[PDB]
Amino acid sequence: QIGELILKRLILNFRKGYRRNDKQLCLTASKFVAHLINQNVAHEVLCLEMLTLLLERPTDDSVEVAIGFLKECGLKLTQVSPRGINAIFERLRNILHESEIDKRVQYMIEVMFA
């Protein structure tokens, strides 16, 4: 119940940072949520929903937020459900190779591939 309240609070903080265009708060809450998904306290569907909402309309900011989340939680999602890894890679390739994205999102995708 305590870690559950922590998860709810981090979800509130992540949705706040994202919906209010707060880079630092969204990044910190995504850090806590990725740490949860790696500690095996947060499920894969919620991380999928986070990565999808960040990559729904990827800009520099939201794609980079997904990239920071992934730089830590890419092991849990790809080892528990490689479907998440395949979806992440394909969606990244499409939204970063078929939309007017710059060296910023280009190098974020490059870090993702690395």
Partner 1 sequence: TTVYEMDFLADLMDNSELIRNVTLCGHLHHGKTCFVDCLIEQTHPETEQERGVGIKSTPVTVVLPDTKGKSYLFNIMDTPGHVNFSDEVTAGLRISDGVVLFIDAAEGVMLNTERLIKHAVQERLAVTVCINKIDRLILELKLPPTDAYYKLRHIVDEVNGLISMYSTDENLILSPLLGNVCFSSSQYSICFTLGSFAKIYADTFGDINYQEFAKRLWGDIYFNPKTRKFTKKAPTSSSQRSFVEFILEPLYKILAQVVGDVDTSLPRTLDELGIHLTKEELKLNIRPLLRLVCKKFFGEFTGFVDMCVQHIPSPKVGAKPKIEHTYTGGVDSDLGEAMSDCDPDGPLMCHTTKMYSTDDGVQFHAFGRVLSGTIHAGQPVKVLGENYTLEDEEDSQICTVGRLWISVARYHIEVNRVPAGNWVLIEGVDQPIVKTATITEPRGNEEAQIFRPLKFNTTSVIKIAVEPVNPSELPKMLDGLRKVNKSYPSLTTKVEESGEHVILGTGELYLDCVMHDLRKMYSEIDIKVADPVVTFCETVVETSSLKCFAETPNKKNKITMIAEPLEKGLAEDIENEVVQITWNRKKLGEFFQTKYDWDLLAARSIWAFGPDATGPNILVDDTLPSEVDKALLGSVKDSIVQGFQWGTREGPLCDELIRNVKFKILDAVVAQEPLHRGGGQIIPTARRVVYSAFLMATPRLMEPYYFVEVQAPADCVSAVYTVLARRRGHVTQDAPIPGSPLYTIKAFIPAIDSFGFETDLRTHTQGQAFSLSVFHHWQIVPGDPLDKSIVIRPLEPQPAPHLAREFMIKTRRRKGL
Partner 2 sequence: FEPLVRDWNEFNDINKIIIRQPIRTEYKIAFPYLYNNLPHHVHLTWYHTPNVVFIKTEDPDLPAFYFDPLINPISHRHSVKSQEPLPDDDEEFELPEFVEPFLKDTPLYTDNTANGIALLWAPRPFNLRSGRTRRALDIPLVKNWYREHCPAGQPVKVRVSYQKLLKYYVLNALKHRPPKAQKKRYLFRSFKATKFFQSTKLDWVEVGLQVCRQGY
CA-closest candidate to residue 48, choices 66, 65, 63, 31: 66
Partner interacting with residue 96 (select from partner 2, partner 1, none; CB below 5-8 Å by kind)? partner 2
Partner interacting with residue 20 (select from partner 2, partner 1, none; CB below 5-8 Å by kind)? none
Binding site for partner 1 (CB under 8 A): 90, 93-94, 97-98, 113
Please tell me the distance from the alpha carbon of residue 10 to that of residue 84, in angstroms, as a whole number.
21
Partner interacting with residue 25 (select from partner 1, partner 2, none; CB below 5-8 Å by kind)? none
CA-closest candidate to residue 62, choices 48, 52, 73, 76: 52
Residue count, binding to partner 2 (CB under 8 A): 19
Asked if 93 is part of the footprint of partner 2 (rule: CB under 8 A), the reply reads yes
DSSP 40: T
Asked if 60 is part of the footprint of partner 2 (rule: CB under 8 A), the reply reads no
